[PDB]
Structure 1
Amino acid sequence: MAKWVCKICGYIYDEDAGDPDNGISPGTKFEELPDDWVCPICGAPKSEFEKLED
């Protein structure tokens, strides 16, 4: 699945890994993340992520 980078800190949200420590099971697409999910490292909102795709 896709990977998205936090433009502030460089954390990669990997849809295959999810973010289970913050309530997100593996396989959750970035668009399916709750509106108040933030970067687990720096706290940036979803708006600050970019999909790693051409």
Structure 2
Amino acid sequence: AKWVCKICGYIYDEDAGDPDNGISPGTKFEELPDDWVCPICGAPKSEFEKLED
């Protein structure tokens, strides 16, 4: 799945992960550590929304 940062528009793509910030490709959004933040704007996990209906 993909999740958008509601603040800045960064897309957390589970297939990409976020390796520069310690997250291997394939990591689901729920599994990101509680203190992971948007790598662009620093928003907390609460500010992301899943891109699905």
Q: TM-score, normalised by structure 2?
A: 1.00
Q: Secondary structure at the match of 1:5?
A: strand
Between the aligned partners of 2:22 and 2:32, the Cα distance in structure 1 is: 10
1:13 Cα deviation after fit: 0.1
Between the aligned partners of 1:45 and 1:5, the Cα distance in structure 2 is: 12
1:52 Cα deviation after fit: 0.1
Q: How many residues align?
A: 53
Deviations 1:23-52 (A, max 9, x none): 000000000000000000000000000000
Percentage identity across paired residues of the two chains = 100
Between the aligned partners of 1:8 and 1:16, the Cα distance in structure 2 is: 21
Q: For structure 2, which runs of at least 5 residues remain unmatched after alignment?
A: none
CA RMSD for the aligned pairs? 0.1
Deviant stretches of 4+, over 3 Å: none
Q: Secondary structure at the match of 1:43?
A: coil
Q: TM-score, normalised by structure 1?
A: 0.98
Q: Secondary structure at the match of 1:4?
A: strand
